[PDB]
Design a protein around this ligand. Structure first.
Ligand code: ANP
Ligand code: MG
Ligand code: MG
Ligand code: ZN
Lengths: 36, 348
C-alpha cells in the first residue's frame, strides 16, 4: 500500500511520501574520492 | 598430524604471518595501525570480499584483554548499517594451552575517514557522512554504550559515501578527539561523543587537526585558546583539579566561530551554499562547547538543519542491541581468566 518506489538495482525500497523518496534516491547517487 | 589444521593455510604479509581458514583467499594489505595489518580477502564460501584483522595475544595485559573481550561480544551483537559487522571470528590454535591469536572477519570497506578529511568535500558529502556517524553513535547509546573516543582513523567509508564506525571505544572508568569531560576526569554522559563529531566536523571544514596536543597539558591548552576558558559554574568533579592548571592558567577568551571557521573554508557558490555554511558553523557552535550542560544532544544534532535533510526512520530508529553480558564493563580478571574468557568467545 506504499506506492512511491526507488529504482536502484538491489533495493526494493518504497516510500509513502514523495519528498522522502527524493532524499533516498539522492543517497544512492552519492560518491566520494580518497587518497591512501 | 591433524585433520583440523588441513582447514588452514599460512600467508606472509611483511613480518606478520596470517594463518587463516582456507575459504579466505587472495589476502592483501589494506591498512595498518598499532595492532598490525588488516587484509582484504575473498571468502570462497560467501563469494564476497571481507576485511580480516589479526589480534596477536589479546590477553598480553589486562586492559587489552578487557578491550578485546569487549569488542568481541559487542561486534557479535550490534547489527547496524553504520557499525562495522563481524562475519566470522576464529583462531588457528587447537587448544587453550596453545591459544594465542584471534582473527576478526568483518565487512570490507574502501578507506578510512582520514583519507576523506584531507580531501575537498561539499556540504552534501560532509553532512551525509556526519549524519551517518550520528546514526551509528545513536545506535550504540540505545544499548548503553558510550564510545568516548571516536576518531577518523577508526571510521571507514566506502566509495558510494557510506560509513561504518570500526570500534566501540573505552571500557567504563593522542587525545585529539577526547572531550574535556574525560580528559579532566569528571563524570561523563552520552553526549561526550558529540564533542568528537564536533572535532571531526571541524576537521573536515578546516582541513587539518583542530586541537593536536603534544602532551596532556598541551591538549587542554590548545582547546582553551580557541574556545576560551570555561565558566566558573562549570568547575566540578575533583577540587584538587579545580585549582589545578586552571584558576590562574593564563586567562583565555576564545575567538568567534565566524573567526574560527571563516567563509574561506566553505564554498560561497550559491545562496544554498551561503545557507549551508551558516547552518554548519552553527551546528559546530553547539558541539564544540566545553561545558556539557550546554552541549547538544545526539538526538538534537540529528534534528539539526545541517543534518536533518537525510532523516529517515529506517536507520534512525533501529532495534537496539541485546548485549548478552551486563557486567561486561565491570568484569575484572587475571590474565589467565581473560585468556579462557576470550578463548570460549572465539570457540562457540
Ligand atoms: N573492515 C575494514 N575495512 C576497511 N579498512 C579497514 C577495516 N578495518 C580496518 N581497516 C583499515 O586498517 C586500519 C587498522 O584498523 P584498526 O582496526 O583501527 O586497527 P588498529 O588501529 O591497530 N586497532 P584500534 O586501536 O582498535 O584502532 C584502519 O585504520 C583502516 O584504515
Ligand atoms: Mg586505530
Ligand atoms: Mg579496537
Ligand atoms: Zn533505494
Amino acid at each position: 500500500d506504499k506506492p512511491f518506489l526507488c529504482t536502484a538495482p538491489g533495493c526494493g525500497r518504497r516510500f509513502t511520501n514523495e519528498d522522502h523518496l527524493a532524499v533516498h534516491k539522492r543517497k544512492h547517487e552519492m560518491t566520494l574520492k580518497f587518497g591512501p | 598430524r591433524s585433520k583440523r589444521d588441513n582447514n588452514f593455510y599460512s600467508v606472509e604479509i611483511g613480518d606478520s604471518t596470517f594463518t587463516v581458514l582456507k575459504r579466505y583467499q587472495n589476502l592483501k594489505p589494506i591498512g595498518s595501525g598499532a595492532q598490525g595489518i588488516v587484509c582484504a580477502a575473498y571468502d570462497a564460501i560467501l563469494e564476497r570480499n571481507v576485511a580480516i584483522k589479526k589480534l596477536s595475544r589479546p590477553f598480553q595485559n589486562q586492559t587489552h584483554a578487557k578491550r578485546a573481550y569487549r569488542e568481541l561480544v559487542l561486534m557479535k551483537c550490534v547489527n547496524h548499517k553504520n557499525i562495522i559487522g563481524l562475519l566470522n571470528v576464529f583462531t588457528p590454535q587447537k587448544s587453550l594451552e596453545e591459544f594465542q591469536d584471534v582473527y576478526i572477519v568483518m565487512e570490507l570497506m574502501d578507506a578510512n575517514l582520514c583519507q576523506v578529511i584531507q580531501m575537498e568535500l561539499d556540504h552534501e558529502r560532509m553532512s551525509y557522512l556526519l549524519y551517518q556517524m550520528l546514526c551509528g553513535i545513536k545506535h550504540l547509546h540505545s544499548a548503553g554504550i558510550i564510545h568516548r573516543d571516536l576518531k577518523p582513523s577508526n571510521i571507514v567509508v566506502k566509495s558510494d559515501c557510506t560509513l561504518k564506525i570500526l570500534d566501540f571505544g573505552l571500557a567504563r572508568t593522542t587525545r585529539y578527539y577526547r572531550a574535556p569531560e574525560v580528559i579532566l576526569g569528571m563524570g561523563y554522559k552520552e553526549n561526550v561523543d558529540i564533542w568528537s563529531v564536533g572535532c571531526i566536523m571541524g576537521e573536515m571544514i578546516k582541513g587539518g587537526v583542530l586541537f593536536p596536543g603534544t602532551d596532556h597539558i598541551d591538549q587542554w591548552n590548545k582547546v582553551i585558546e580557541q574556545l576560551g576558558t570555561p565558566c566558573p559554574e562549570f568547575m566540578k568533579k575533583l577540587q584538587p583539579t579545580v585549582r589545578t592548571y586552571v584558576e590562574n592558567r593564563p586567562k583565555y577568551a576564545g575567538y568567534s566561530f565566524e573567526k574560527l571557521f571563516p567563509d574561506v573554508l566553505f564554498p560561497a557558490d550559491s545562496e544554498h551554499n551561503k545557507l549551508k555554511a551558516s547552518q554548519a558553523r552553527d551546528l559546530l557552535s553547539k558541539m564544540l562547547v566545553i561545558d556539557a550542560s550546554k552541549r547538544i544532544s545526539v538526538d538534537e544534532a540529528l534534528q539539526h538543519p545541517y543534518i536533518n535533510v537525510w532523516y529517515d526512520p529506517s536507520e534512525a530508529e533501529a532495534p537496539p542491541p541485546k548485549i548478552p553480558d551486563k557486567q561486561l564493563d565491570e568484569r575484572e580478571h587475571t590474565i589467565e581468566e581473560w585468556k579462557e574468557l576470550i578463548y570460549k568467545e572465539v570457540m562457540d
